Amino acid sequence: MGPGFDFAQAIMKKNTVIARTEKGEFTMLGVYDRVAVIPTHASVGEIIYINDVETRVLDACALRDLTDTNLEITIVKLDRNQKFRDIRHFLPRCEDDYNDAVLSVHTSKFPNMYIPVGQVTNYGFLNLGGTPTHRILMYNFPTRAGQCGGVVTTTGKVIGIHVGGNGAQGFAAMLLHSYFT
Known about the structure:
- It is classed as viral protein.
- The assembly is monomeric.
- The chain is about 5% helix and about 55% strand.
- It starts with a helix and ends in a 7-residue tail after the last strand.
- The protein is mainly beta.
- It has one helix spanning about 5-15, and strands at about 15-20, 25-30, 35-40, 45-50, 55-65, 70-80, 100-105, 115-130, 130-140, 150-155, 155-165, 170-175.
- It has one helix and twelve strands, in the order H-E-E-E-E-E-E-E-E-E-E-E-E.
- It folds into two domains: about 1-15 and about 85-180, no CATH class; about 15-85, no CATH class.
């Protein structure tokens, strides 16, 4: 509908796949080469389904900060025959707050879904499902089951992936450029 939705669509149309684990179907962001991200609660194993095709997992790393605190991001290298468009230049370098973000989801349950979530707070610490988590972004939208892995964007930046909510707020894990050197 406007330039925020334009940037979000451009990311969804080229840099997402549908990932299925034993814990559900997730929006999965491809970042560069065969490297993608997914919420750590997806419990990625040795095999994952990518657009309903059986795919070997070459590597999976559940990120933690240097205090050994959960970040809720798993970086996955896929045994896929095709590379993603490199979007690392759209990743922020530092923790920040944002205006006018969009959350975009693409699954069997929610195809072509886009949500203007408004202002995004650097929330920091969250007890996420009982697990102490750092580098959390918050937005005041009543996000639902089926939105985990959703991509959070502003114009020109890919800033996080949706990892949870409390019924009134939604929470995303930050993406930082330094995760993908």
